[PDB]
Design a protein around this ligand. Structure first.
Ligand code: MG
Ligand code: ZN
Lengths: 1319, 652
DNA sequence: GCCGTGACTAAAGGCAAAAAAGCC
RNA sequence: GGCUUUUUUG
DNA sequence: TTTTAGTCACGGC
């Protein structure tokens, strides 16, 4: 099956594995997040509804008044996205909230309602997500990347024996909440349990534990096992079981029933343990010395004296034994306290506890929280209550509670958002168990411990913070109670919420500036997973652990796409099929494998649940029914990789592209490249510049269509139809009969964007790609944007490349480029620069814009009009004047084009403050857009009138009126005709009513547009008017420009060589680019060679088609060849049949293939060498791929054959003309009198301390004296140096640098006296 | 400083000063009114805190912040730190007469020249042009000269050409790790906007032509120009200061050309013919009557300096090839013919240059280096050496070997299940088996790649060293090594986890054939680790350099001979295996603290206070000296410096 | 009570370049 | 025209 | 965050 939009150029698709899951909408990470933020949720779980319900209702301090939340609605945005970009205003919607203030009677019982007031409050302005998942803030277009932090919960960690010199491991537990203070339990080198809150001072654990109203007896019973002693005749015995004797030593001969059971002295034996188990004897005789190491459990006192005999956690001796025996206490309770099994960490902590009253414990907690303050009981109680057990100051949220219950092996995943008694008890018990061998520690890098915080969650958090601030304000206002004097509008101020939301969206570490220099960069930036930002790591504190790649990144996070330099592995990019779980964790598709048969039921598996199952490999051969052809297959179980059986498999990958991201999936032959070179290739492909004319990639991957469509650069038809009118700036689609709604059928109109400045000063331009009267369907591209060819990504060109050394002009990485490339303007790009001149109101008279400029000739003002604003289309150059600005004194302050760049003014946008006289250029511009609006409205009215009159004619003709008479009648008289049919008469009357309402509607719309456009503007205070100028520079390639490939083989053009010097093959066709072969072996990027060999084969097919069309051969011979090429391959997935194509369709397809038949190659399922050889043999090219060239300059054959083929070249955004810089004498700084820095300020190169050391390593002292004194900052020594040079002399004066005197004053500005001395 | 608008740009210091003066005024007014001591003490404490913040903010505790909620800059913080005055405006400062640009490659330049764009040159040398322009009367006032220069007349170009005759410029690349990162050159006026750089210096600069940028400075006074010419110019810097090894070693493109030129073939066009001399060998190769490398007999006149520094002619018939005979036409007089008779890989060619520096001085050495570069580029272009997908020969036994290796682990997995083998020893056995299999595959691949079959003149099959392109780049030393060629044809081998554990299953697929999703995923563990280490090692290393420069910045040679017999005993280092360093290198270029005693009693082999050079070192080797005592800087008794003799010899 | 030990606090952690913002 | 935060090149 | 060193308070026989 094939639709008409792709029948133009079918891409020959290699690849054997059938695809099951189509690539999802690439922006669904963004769109599906913010959608939850501003959608109505009756359950009150997501976004604004839950944010309001989390704070409201409001109760007064006296309890006599309250505020109720009802609902909310979002208004219509004042300006559209295009208007917002033009006018420099935020695209946002107003938030209207319905509040209800009800006051309770003071003398009446609770629940007595006095008054009910319902009103709407303008609570603030919420920025909106554009259709492309991007935000418009201030005329710009920002993207909020998704953070990757640690999920709230409990995490068990170990220090790996690195802190202490003895190498012992120090386990610990952390309790991370979603909001509130932290909590840590940790051990010490002496095996003492400790607790620390908010990383503050270390405290003994039980201090906090006894803060929960615990008695020491209860603590010991809860944290230990009781051992019972009964005082029998002459001895005291215990009941004994084998399980309490494992891994112990017999202090005495363990024997009972008069028979020896265990030996004396040596360690215990398992056989005697089994003998005790089978005998089932409990009570055993006990000596005296065996009790000397035990610790009493509960308090025991005398009932006669009433004094304390033995206390909890106290060592006991024979004296206490006799004291308890004489008191009649037959029952004695001790602790298990076995070194191997039940470590005695609680007992020793109870030993080191300073007190046991819990009041001194609370006082100590209060002291640790904040030092230097009286320990009032009420303050300490309030602090302890509000530190963990207050919902206002502490919250675990749903994900935190889920992780908390899962990590402790509980059963439910729902509970309170705060801690409790049982939570802390379980955490301590689990940490003790971990210290006691049982259990394992967690891994921080695991993707089961880190979740995705999208834009919706961030906005919800910021909105909640603002709402809490407003809550505090309204509470302090309601504290002053009153009798219905206030109206619930002055109590709520939108300023705090608006400021918080605005600052989050505008100035933040994650609301980054979108880089739109091609669709791929936009897609990659939108689908990014940043680990930095608030509540995250930093570029300096991150070590080698988070930066490294984990086995669970398989399918969720791309391994080979991460920026190099200071943050590598922190800004990794999301994978292709990976989506976000319900709680925020990542998850990937997997095809369930049943009874050895692979099905097509996709299950989304998260990180942790990947461990339990056994997952097969993506590229495993199968039959037609899913049976594995091999009884042994490759699988991964727990981050491992080993051979399993065909019955032990449980899941299978959907496709081979599942592991890589988008940018890495656009690279052909990725599996033949080293990982570093693939990384560099993806990063540089993200930097490509849109050329003048886009050209398809001969060797691709098939993701080009997805990347082009998903990014908002191609105009995609909403409904199918036929192109009624096609133009360079608009497309009109008459919707097909099946797709009209019951009312208001109408048509569709798409308005393209022509030569609009991008964020990187590039050019965004859209061109129609459909012909007049051509059918279209939904989802089909109607106008390709920048770097797109017929709805297909195309970032660079394809050049005939040769791998050979050529006289040293391609020495290390340089490239040699023929002049035929420059002549054809293949790599010519367009850049658009914006200049802004702002009229302010300064002192000594305001600044004016006029053509009266002194000390300038007529040439400098010829390009200017009497208005002073340069004409649109003037070929301005460096140094000229765009806007004539002068400041009264009069001094010339006119805006000028910075030197080094040509220009051609294409647009001038003028913003004039309200109530300010408008200049002539402003009047001309305003007449321009009012005429444009008039034309647009007239066209819409004419289209709607045509539709209405078609309906009118259809109704009247069906009513008995002849068609000829109706046509000969005026259109207005059609509604006035009397119809014998009442139903037809009613229809005509309704049509006339619609006629009148329609004309009223267009009149109102025209009046509204007139009022809107002609009205003034809002902008920064202290500005008279704002004028903007756009300049269009047409860059070409020159020696110094940076070019690259898709496989990381960057380079710099070193020479533009004449066409007569390029090597030429037997047919006389010169090559366009000469590359160095020696860059392939060391770099190990063999992908470029295979791409070259495949492109040579692909162009061979295209040339033959170009030969058939030139000879004007019939369709029958042509159709035969195209079918032969498309049928090539071994077990090719794609099946293209030309039988369904008409003759015109075949001719058009062949017309679109004369530049070379495109080739598709999946990432890890690409074409092998045999397919390339077969494709080459189909053409007229050698199978080896190496042809015999000739030297252009000498005409002599090269001694060896060389590799020639077509390779895809990109022009990176590092142009030499934007980097060349020089300076003799410019402007100097203010304090240090040193030359400025940067190209913009005409600054000089910094001569750093390393260069000073380099000059010191020589014998160079006079050069150093120059660089330090007479070139940098010796004010009295550089004015004379300039005079000497012009005088013909070359001599310096040492002087005294002015950057050292300042230092003296600085040190002299303190109490220190530093001074020089005598001569 | 006033900015655009009603707001004014004020520094962090003004706010602190205003705070302090306001607090002082409040205390002055409050104390004179006999206010209670409750408020007086608090006001005085607040004044103390304000002065503390002004003098040094943040030392005590929470630093006072402005509207930005960021700590303000105090006087103490304005000096301390990387942004402070000392490390930003005193040690290193911005300079005039400087430019920055992208560097490309120019192979037509000489060793002492660089390409300078016309626009950059005209902007840099603006003051010099004004002097000449008014000197010749072409412009009376300075304003007329400035107007004439910007209009870009025709005579201005001639004047600029005149003023760049012998005016060196300092080319610089950041970072400048060593003293060769700043070098003087004589600029050449070229078009474009890129700084053309001589290839041979690229080794010194550590620069590659993939977007690198370099900065150019201009000396002004006569002393600076003479210092540049006499100390900095690249013709004077051909030896490293760290060791005697040169920095003008040809690499990459040149090495491949010189290796292809001097490499014989058993059968070629025009073999066995006898030539008059090297000049004829060039007429045959150009005419196409003889291949570039055919074994011939030629007559060569070589000059040896065996006399007392005098050259003597010598004629003989040598059995060599056309390529070596052609190359002999550029070597200088002193060198013998045995130098250019081998294959001349990367390590040989450098030695050749070294030999010249040992015999003929500096000017013949630099001329020979330039001729080497030109000839190598020319005969590398003429070779047409290319890499193709068919040049990576996969050994045929490889898969078979892999199968056998698999069988081995197929045994152990069974034996581990019978209890005869535990977990750890099974891991060790599998690792050893896979390592042995990888080694065998690598050896088989190398044996297959390094030889080829060719029929000789008589018609019998004879083996010769292969002409495979990838092997020519690997063997000559131009690019790559054995590991890369192994990873392109043989199996990639075992890979390690991020922690360090070796994966049990190795990557059995080379880059020539495909790598599946699982192998490519486990191959990124090493790559990301290496990239992270490289990214985080630049910050640590450079810091170390600073701590090494500031400790030893003030040590300058100030004496000729301190006259002390103290020294350190220098012997060759032995770790229990082969000697890591011979005694010759540890004593070369030093002076003996005392006379060296022969093992025979009372014989003085080396006089005291004598510099040991290569000629003496060879005499030391033939005598088989055991240990030589020499002077060292740490034993010097000179005050506030080190004498010339204790340091030894200037390596540069 | 004096030398040994643990806890509390300060400094330091590339070089050059560009491109954006936003504040003051 | 100073500071800060991001992004990128070597 | 990690490393390192300097300094104040505690400890054991
Ligand atoms: Mg580089
Ligand atoms: Zn000395």
């Amino acid at each position: 099956v094939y639709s008409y939009t792709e029948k133009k150029r079918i891409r020959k698709d290699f690849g054997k594995r059938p695809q099951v899951l189509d690539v999802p909408y690439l922006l669904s990470i963004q769109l599906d997040s913010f959608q939850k933020f501003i959608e109505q949720d009756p359950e009150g779980q997501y976004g604004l509804e839950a944010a309001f319900r989390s704070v409201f209702p409001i109760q007064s301090y006296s309890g006599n008044s309250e505020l109720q939340y009802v609902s909310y609605r979002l208004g219509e945005p004042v300006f559209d996205v295009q208007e917002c970009q033009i006018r420099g205003v935020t695209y946002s919607a107003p938030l209207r909230v319905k509040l209800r203030l009800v006051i309770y009677e003071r003398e009446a019982p609770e629940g007595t309602v006095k008054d009910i007031k319902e009103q709407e409050v303008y609570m603030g302005e919420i920025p909106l997500m554009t259709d492309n998942g991007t935000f418009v803030i201030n005329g710009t277009e920002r993207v909020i990347v998704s953070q990757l932090h640690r999920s709230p919960g409990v995490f068990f960690d170990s220090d790996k024996g690195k802190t202490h010199s003895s190498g012992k491991v120090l386990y610990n537990a952390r309790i991370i909440p979603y909001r509130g203070s932290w909590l840590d339990f940790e051990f010490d080198p002496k095996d003492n349990l400790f607790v620390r809150i908010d990383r503050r001072r270390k405290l003994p654990a039980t201090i906090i534990l006894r803060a929960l109203n615990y008695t020491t007896e209860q603590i010991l019973d809860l944290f230990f096992e009781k051992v019972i002693f009964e005082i029998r005749d002459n001895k005291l015995q215990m009941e004994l079981v084998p399980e309490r004797l494992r891994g112990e030593t017999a202090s005495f001969d363990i024997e009972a029933n008069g028979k020896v059971y265990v030996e004396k002295g040596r360690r215990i034996t398992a056989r005697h343990i089994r003998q005790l188990e089978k005998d089932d004897v409990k009570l055993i005789e006990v000596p005296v010395e065996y009790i000397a190491g035990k610790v009493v459990a509960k308090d025991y006192i005398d009932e006669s004296t009433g004094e304390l005999i033995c206390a909890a956690n106290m060592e006991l001796s024979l004296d206490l034994l006799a004291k308890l025996s004489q008191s009649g206490h037959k029952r004695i309770e001790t602790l298990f306290t076995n070194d191997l099994d039940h470590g005695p960490y609680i007992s020793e902590t109870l030993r080191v506890d300073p007190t046991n009253d819990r009041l001194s414990a609370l006082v100590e907690i209060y002291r640790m929280m904040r030092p230097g303050e009286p320990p009032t009981r009420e303050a300490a109680e309030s602090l302890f209550e509000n530190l963990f057990f207050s919902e206002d100051r502490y919250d675990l949220s749903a994900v935190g509670r889920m992780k908390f219950n899962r990590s402790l092996l509980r059963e439910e995943i729902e509970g309170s958002g705060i801690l409790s008694k049982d939570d802390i008890i379980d955490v301590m018990k689990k940490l003790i168990d971990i210290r006691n061998g049982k259990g394992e520690v967690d891994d921080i890098d695991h993707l089961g411990n880190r979740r995705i915080r999208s834009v919706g969650e961030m906005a919800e958090n910021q909105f909640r913070v603002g709402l809490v601030r407003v809550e505090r304000a309204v509470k302090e206002r309601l504290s002053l109670g009153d009798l219905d004097t206030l109206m619930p509008q002055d109590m709520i101020n939108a300023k705090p919420i608006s400021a918080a939301v605005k600052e989050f969206f505008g100035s933040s570490q994650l609301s980054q500036f979108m880089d739109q220099n091609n669709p791929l960069s936009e897609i990659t930036h939108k689908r990014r997973i940043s680990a930095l930002g608030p509540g995250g790591l930093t570029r300096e504190r991150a070590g080698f652990e988070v930066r490294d790649v984990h086995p669970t990144h398989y399918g969720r996070v791309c391994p080979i796409e991460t920026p190099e330099g200071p943050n590598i592995g922190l800004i990794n990019s999301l994978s292709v099929y990976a989506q976000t779980n319900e709680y925020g964790f990542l998850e990937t598709p997997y095809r369930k494998v049943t009874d050895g048969v692979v099905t097509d039921e996709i299950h989304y598996l998260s990180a942790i649940e990947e461990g339990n199952y056994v997952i097969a490999q993506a590229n495993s051969n199968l039959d037609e029914e899913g049976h594995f052809v091999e009884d042994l297959v490759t699988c991964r179980s727990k981050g491992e990789s080993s051979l399993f059986s065909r019955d032990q498999v449980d899941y299978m990958d959907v496709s081979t592209q599942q592991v890589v991201s988008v940018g890495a999936s656009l690279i052909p032959f990725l599996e033949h490249d080293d990982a570093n070179r693939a990384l560099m290739g993806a990063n540089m492909q993200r930097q490509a510049v849109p050329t003048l004319r886009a050209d398809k990639p001969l060797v691709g991957t098939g993701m080009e269509r997805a990347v082009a469509v998903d990014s908002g650069v191609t105009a995609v038809a909403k409904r199918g139809g036929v192109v009624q009118y096609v133009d360079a700036s608009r497309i009109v689609i008459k919707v097909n009969e099946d797709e009209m709604y019951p009312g208001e059928a109408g048509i569709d109109i798409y308005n393209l964007t022509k030569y609009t400045r991008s964020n990187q000063n590039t050019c965004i331009n859209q061109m129609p790609c459909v012909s007049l009267g051509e059918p279209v369907e939904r989802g089909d591209v109607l106008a390709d944007g920048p770097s797109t060819d017929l709805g297909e990504l195309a970032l660079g060109q394809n050049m005939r490349v040769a791998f050979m050394p050529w006289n040293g002009y391609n020495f290390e990485d340089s490239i040699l480029v023929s002049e035929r490339v420059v002549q054809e303007d293949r790599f010519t790009t367009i850049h658009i620069q914006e200049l802004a001149c702002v009229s302010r109101d300064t002192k000594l008279g305001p600044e004016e814009i006029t053509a009266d400029i002194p000390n300038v000739g007529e040439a400098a003002l010829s390009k200017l009009d009497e208005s002073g604003i340069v004409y649109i289309g003037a070929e301005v150059t460096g140094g000229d004047i765009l806007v004539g600005k002068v400041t009264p004194k009069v001094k010339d302050s006119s805006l000028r084009v910075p030197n080094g760049v040509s220009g051609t003014v294409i647009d001038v946008q003028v913003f004039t403050r309200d109530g300010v006289e408008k200049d002539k250029r402003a009047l001309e511009i305003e007449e321009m857009q009012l005429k444009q609006a008039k034309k647009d409205l007239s066209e819409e009215l004419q289209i709607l009138e045509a539709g209405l009159f078609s309906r009118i004619r259809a109704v009247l003709v069906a009513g008995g009126v002849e068609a000829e008479k109706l046509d000969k009648l005026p259109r207005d008289r059609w509604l006035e005709l009397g119809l014998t049919d009442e139903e037809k008469q009613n229809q005509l009357e309704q049509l006339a009513e619609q006629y009148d309402e329609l004309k009223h509607e267009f009149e109102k719309k025209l009046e509204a547009k007139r009022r809107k456009i002609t009205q003034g503007d809002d902008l920064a205070p202290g500005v008279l008017k704002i004028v903007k100028v756009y300049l269009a520079v047409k860059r070409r390639i020159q020696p110094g420009d940076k070019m690259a490939g898709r496989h990381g083989n960057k380079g710099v053009i070193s020479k533009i060589n004449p066409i007569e010097d390029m090597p030429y093959d037997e047919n006389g066709t010169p090559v366009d680019i000469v590359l160095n072969p020696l860059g392939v072996p060391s770099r190990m990027n063999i992908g470029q060679i295979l791409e070259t060999h495949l492109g040579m084969a692909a162009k061979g097919i295209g040339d033959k088609i170009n030969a058939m069309l030139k000879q004007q051969q019939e369709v029958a011979k042509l159709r035969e060849f195209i079918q032969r090429a498309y049928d090539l391959g071994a077990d090719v997935r794609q099946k293209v049949d030309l039988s369904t194509f008409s003759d015109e369709e075949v001719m058009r397809l062949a017309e679109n293939l004369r530049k070379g038949m495109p080739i598709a190659t999946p990432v890890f399922d690409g074409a092998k060498e045999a397919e390339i050889k077969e494709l080459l043999k189909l053409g007229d090219l050698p199978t080896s791929g190496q042809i015999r060239l000739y030297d252009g300059r000498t005409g002599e054959q090269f001694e060896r054959p060389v590799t020639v083929g077509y390779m895809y070249m990109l022009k990176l955004n590092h142009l030499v003309d934007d980097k060349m810089h020089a300076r003799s004498t410019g402007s100097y700084s203010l304090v240090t009198q040193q030359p400025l820095g940067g190209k913009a300020q005409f600054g000089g190169q910094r001569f750093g301390e390393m260069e000073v050391w380099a000059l010191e390593a020589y014998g160079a002292a006079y050069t150093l004296q120059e660089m330090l004194t007479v070139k940098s900052d010796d004010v009295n020594g550089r004015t004379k140096m300039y005079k000497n040079i012009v005088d013909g002399n070359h001599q310096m004066e040492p002087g005294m640098p002015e950057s050292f005197n300042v230092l003296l004053k600085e040190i002299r500005s303190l109490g220190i006296n530093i001074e020089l001395e005598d001569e | 400083v006033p900015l655009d608008g009603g707001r004014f740009a004020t520094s962090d210091l003004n706010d602190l000063y205003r705070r302090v003066i306001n607090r002082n005024n409040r205390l002055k007014r409050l104390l004179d009114l006999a206010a209670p001591d409750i408020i007086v003490r608090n006001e005085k404490r607040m004044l103390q805190e304000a002065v503390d913040a002004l003098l040094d903010n943040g030392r005590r505790g929470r630093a006072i912040t402005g509207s930005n909620k960021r700590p303000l800059k105090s006087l103490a913080d304005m000096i301390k730190g990387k942004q402070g005055r000392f490390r930003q405006n005193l040690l290193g400062k911005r300079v005039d007469y400087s430019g920055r640009s992208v560097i490309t490659v120019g192979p037509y330049l000489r060793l002492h020249q660089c390409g300078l764009p016309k626009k950059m040159a005209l902007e840099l040398f603006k003051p010099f042009i004004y002097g000449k322009l008014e000197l010749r009367g072409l412009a009376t006032t300075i304003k007329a000269a400035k107007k004439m220069v910007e209009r870009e007349e025709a005579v201005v170009w001639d004047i600029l050409d005149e003023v760049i005759r012998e005016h060196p410029v300092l080319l610089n690349r950041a970072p400048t790790l060593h003293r060769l990162g700043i070098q003087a050159f004589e600029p050449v006026l070229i078009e474009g906007k890129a700084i053309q750089l001589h290839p041979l210096v690229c080794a010194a600069y550590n620069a590659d032509f993939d977007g690198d940028q370099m900065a150019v400075h201009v000396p002004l006074t006569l002393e600076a120009q003479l210092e540049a010419r006499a100390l900095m110019m690249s013709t004077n810097n051909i030896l490293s200061p760290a060791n005697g090894e040169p920095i003008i070693v040809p690499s990459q493109d040149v090495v491949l050309g010189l290796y292809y030129m001097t490499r014989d073939c058993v059968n070629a066009k025009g073999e066995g013919m006898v030539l008059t001399g090297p000049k004829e060998a060039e007429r045959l190769y150009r005419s196409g009557l003889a291949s570039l490398h055919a074994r011939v007999k030629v007559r060569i006149t070589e000059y040896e300096k065996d006399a007392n520094g005098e050259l003597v002619a010598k004629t003989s018939l040598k059995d060599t090839t056309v390529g070596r005979a052609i190359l002999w036409m550029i070597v200088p007089k002193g060198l013998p013919y045995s130098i250019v008779n081998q294959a001349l890989g990367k390590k040989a060619i450098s030695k050749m240059l070294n030999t010249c520096y040992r015999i003929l001085g500096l000017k013949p050495t630099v001329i020979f280096a330039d001729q080497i570069m030109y000839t190598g580029f020319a005969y590398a272009a003429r070779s047409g050496a290319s890499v193709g997908i068919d040049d990576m020969v996969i050994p045929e036994k490889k898969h078979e070997i892999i199968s056998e290796a698999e069988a081995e682990v197929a045994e152990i997995q069974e034996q581990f299940q019978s209890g005869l083998v535990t977990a750890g020893e099974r891991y060790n056995k599998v690792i050893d088996i896979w390592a042995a299999a990888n080694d065998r595959v690598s050896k088989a691949m190398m044996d297959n790649l390094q030889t080829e079959t060719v029929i000789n003149r008589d018609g019998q099959e004879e083996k010769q060293v292969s002409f495979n392109s990838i092997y020519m780049m690997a063997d000559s030393g131009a690019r790559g090594s054995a590991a890369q060629i192994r990873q392109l044809a043989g199996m990639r081998g075992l890979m390690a986890k991020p922690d360090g554990s070796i994966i049990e299953t190795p990557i059995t697929a080379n880059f020539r054939e495909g790598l599946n999703v699982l192998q490519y995923f486990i191959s990124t563990h090493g790559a990301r680790k290496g990239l992270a280490d490289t990214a985080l090692k630049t910050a640590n290393s450079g810091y170390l350099t600073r701590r090494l420069v500031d400790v030893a910045q003030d040590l300058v040679v100030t004496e000729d001979d301190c006259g002390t017999h103290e020294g350190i005993m220098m012997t060759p280092v032995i770790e229990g295996g082969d000697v890591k360093e011979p005694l010759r290198d540890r004593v070369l270029g030093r002076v003996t603290a005392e006379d060296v005693l022969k093992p025979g009693t009372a014989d003085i082999l080396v006089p005291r206070n004598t510099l040991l050079h290569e000629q003496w070192c060879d005499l030391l080797e033939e005598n088989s000296v055991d240990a030589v005592k020499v002077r060292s800087v740490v034993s010097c008794d000179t005050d506030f410096g080190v004498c010339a003799h204790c340091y030894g010899r200037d390596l540069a």
